Symmetry: C3
Subunit: 333 residues, 3 copies
């Protein structure tokens, strides 16, 4: 179909060729900004940014991408608007679609963003839901490509360790499906994503020359990895009781120097969508470090996080370039 | 001019003539935007948006309107600044007035917005107070004209059912005073607006060929109505302790299909300033529904809300074009 | 020397000459805006505004200053982002430095803004920390220059009364160190600023033709004052419990007409960084009045605050012109 006037709710709504085009557009916009040759395509466009959860990267990416492109934005945060508590999403979508050219939504159930897209009458982009986080994967893939230039995604081995059933796990399944990556989801069975989704995506991944492996075996799982990726063990919005349960299950899947060693690959790089709990320099991070005896980092150690192998800030930067591409592609021709 | 640097705090501060001019400006600005011939008149202008209460429509109307007109905005929400608690309104006014070209204020007592207007030295616009919501009526009036083209306001019958002593009830009175509408406030005597304002506003409406009827009788009260309007029974900022007494006094005044049929006009349309509790798709909407046994809708039924007679979203869109007229008229020329 | 691509974290990181240049740029920018001859130098720049505390003057100064100069801003308030609770400052700094051209930070410990500066890779400006509030002094100095034309700072006597160990007391010390002001901190001993800073700053102030006097004696400290300055007795972030002890200790240092009279100078002017508790018009201002028997105001009486001698709003206005100078001086040649 293409991107013009299309929503961006999850990756599987696009073809491998579409995903690839988006990535090339992101790379091009990245270079034009860096060279002072950026051509504003969204001048005069007004964009609404709905956030029902906290955000630094996604919030800032949409803001900077919009401003660079000549657009203006309205940030509607977790509090201060009628959204959710006093007004239905169907109503919110119908009001915003009459005033804005595009709408970003970060929140809970994927069904909320789906309903918004159905009733907005303008492009709606998923800035993170409980089930999927498509723009993140766009940033991740562009980063991997830049770090293994002249290496097709189907020549790459990517390991995602930890909670494989959160939005990132699901998104990992989608990206392999459209790229042919050799995806390894290294986690305990209790944190494995939906079998039906794994089946669908593995078939598609193989079709593109890759595979999808779900294993509890760290050694076998990370062998030959080009990239090890992780994320917090309890996501935004989950009840705090999930920490005890999750840490008991996932502490052995922490990304630390031993795991980096187990890949047998001196060039392996480390990725993390962020925010990360890698030291005691955050309120909640210090809380959990003491409550669960995790000193030196949780899902990843500060050692790996700050090591030469870590490319999380290149990854974070790309969040803005890929989000700019999504808005340019869906709002201009 | 005539509007130049004039505050917009309530409708009785204007004449029928001024009202028509703003409505005409709004209509022109609406067509210019849609046709793409919008000429920015507020380039370089900086506007402060003080919000002591939640907002989706008003917040977005001021932002989009300002952006379309080349102005910039600073959103000062319920949290984050010194307003209310740490600093007097008088002080806040004199500070903002030294930095901004205009100030929108949404909050509590009308005296706050009057004090702000007193000391700001720049135009102040009321984006809702406990007593009045003038920008909403501009949108409503424009919407009605568009839906009964060619008809003058004294040729239209408008019914407002429910809590007639909230900000909307007072603003309906004001609107009738300046248009000569045949206004019917259908509500229990306990929710009737202040007699003094009714009397003042009735004399003026009649001068304009209209009238103001306050009746507890629904059947006779809605006969011949061109429009049926309603709003939530407990307004933002009112003690939650008021819901029981309100629901009991007002549930009989719910805008449902029986009320619509009672007008005897097949062309009757439904208006609601929004947000509306018309189903179980909102947090407090679902809670109050099950708490008082009101499913399928509260002040309005989902059935009427979603019917072909409902024009609430044309009405919501008009919030932006009319707020734009207000800023353009008072800041420009 | 210069400001180009330098941080602005505290005054002592600059020379008397650099400060003077900044103040002159502020006066120019102020005059240019007023004459409608302002030339935007930050067109296309994107700035992140981190606020961990509330703000009206600083928030709006940064927004208006940026808009006037063609830059855009992303307000990251006390809630809605990952800052501090979910993500460390090093991480935040490295993420924002990849997307923005400049970062403003208002919060707590000075070490937070220093780390931010160390890791951002872009200029970061201190919009207030527990220890320093440099942009405020720029506004104060410009207002003093403007109100005592053709009198060098070292020909002026400045009195700061009250809690002299908060960010404002420390900043007064720095300001006197760079200008040669005859500064008097009229405050009880328990509230005198740290010894080492007093010593370092007095030598520099003297080098510049001024002095720094700490005294518990009001009459002696305010004699011959050209300006009397004060601030709230309990600062943002400090425990509410401090009010009890602070009022008992500082009540004697309230700025009232008697203190103005004790200067022996008919032309003495009054300054206050704001917010100010000078009447009951505040939430936590009405109470503390009745609760602690403080009538007429707290750190300052309403009589003094509203008197002809008060120039607090010229001072507040200058917060914007000086913050504009800071961003222009650091982001452009
Ligand atoms: N599983 C996590 C994923 C967080 C992604 N956060 P990210 N890279 O989009 N930055 S943020 O600053 O915009 O939050 C969760 O749901 O909590
Ligand atoms: N009586 C109600 C009126 C709400 C008007 N809300 P409205 N049309 O201005 N949209 S909002 O999204 O900006 O709140 C009350 O005071 O709660
Ligand atoms: N010592 C005080 C100083 C407050 C400065 N506040 P100011 N002139 O920057 N306005 S504000 O509206 O931006 O807060 C304290 O730390 O609480």
């Amino acid at each position: 179909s293409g991107f013009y006037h299309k929503h961006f709710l999850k990756l599987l709504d696009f073809t491998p060729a579409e995903l690839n085009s988006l990535l090339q557009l992101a790379a091009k916009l990245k270079a034009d900004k860096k060279s002072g040759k950026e051509e504003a395509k969204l001048t005069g466009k007004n964009i609404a940014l709905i956030f029902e959860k906290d955000s630094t990267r996604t919030r800032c990416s949409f803001e900077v991408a919009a401003y660079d492109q000549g657009a203006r934005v309205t940030y509607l945060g977790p509090s201060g608007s009628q959204i959710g508590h006093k007004e239905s999403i169907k109503d919110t979508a119908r009001v915003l679609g009459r005033m804005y050219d595009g709408i970003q939504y970060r929140g809970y159930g994927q069904e909320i963003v789906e309903t918004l897209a159905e009733y907005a009458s303008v492009p709606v982009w998923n800035g993170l839901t409980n089930e999927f986080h498509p723009t993140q994967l766009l940033a991740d893939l562009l980063t991997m490509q830049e770090h293994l230039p002249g290496k097709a995604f189907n020549e790459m081995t990517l390991v995602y360790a930890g909670d494989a059933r959160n939005n990132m796990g699901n998104s990992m399944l989608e990206a392999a499906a459209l790229t042919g990556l050799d995806l390894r989801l290294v986690a305990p069975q209790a944190c494995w994503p939906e079998a039906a989704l794994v089946t669908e995506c593995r078939a598609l991944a193989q079709q593109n020359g890759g595979n999808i492996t779900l294993t509890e075996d760290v050694a076998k799982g990370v062998e030959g990895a080009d990239f090890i990726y992780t994320d917090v063990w309890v996501s935004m919005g989950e009840a705090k009781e999930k920490w005890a349960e999750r840490i008991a299950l996932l502490r052995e899947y922490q990304v630390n120097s031993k795991m980096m060693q187990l890949t047998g690959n001196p060039e392996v790089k480390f990725l993390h969508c962020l925010p990360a709990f890698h030291d005691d320099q955050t309120t909640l991070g210090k809380k959990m470090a003491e409550e669960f005896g995790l000193h030196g980092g949780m899902e990843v150690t500060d050692e790996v996080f700050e090591s030469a192998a870590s490319i999380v800030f290149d990854q974070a930067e790309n969040r803005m370039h890929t989000i700019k591409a999504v808005m340019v592609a869906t709002l201009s021709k």
